[PDB]
């Protein structure tokens, strides 16, 4: 798994620091093991349509 | 002249040291840090 450039979220989602919203709150999250397993499940469902 | 280049590793190190100095662990454990302070909110996007 590869991650996007952090500056994309730096210049768009946290462009104003005086306010907070759903995306700004969620950018501070770090996944656990079961959530990474869920990501693998999502990709497996994507590669086998239907 | 204070010089900072575009390299990501040095900027990450500078960000980590600044976070340590502005938000030390001992103040976090004792619940002594105010997250709504302007100089704390500014640290999100300083040297990205």
């Amino acid at each position: 798994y590869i991650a996007p450039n952090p500056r994309i979220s730096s210049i768009t989602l946290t462009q104003r620091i005086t306010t907070t919203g759903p995306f700004a709150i969620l950018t501070g999250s770090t996944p656990t093991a079961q959530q990474l397993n869920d990501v693998r499940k999502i990709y497996l469902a994507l590669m086998f349509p239907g | 002249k204070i010089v900072v280049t575009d390299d990501a590793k040095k900027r990450y190190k500078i960000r980590l040291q600044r976070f340590r100095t502005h938000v030390p662990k001992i103040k976090v454990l004792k619940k002594l840090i105010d997250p709504n302070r302007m100089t704390v909110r500014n640290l999100e996007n300083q040297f990205v």
Binding site: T27, G28 | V23, V28, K31, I33, E44
Partner: peptide, 15 residues
């Protein structure tokens, strides 16, 4: 460890 986010800091200390 990893560099913290200012949004996660208030979540942690609010507890």
């Amino acid at each position: 460890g990893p560099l913290l986010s200012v949004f996660a800091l208030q979540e942690i200390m609010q507890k």
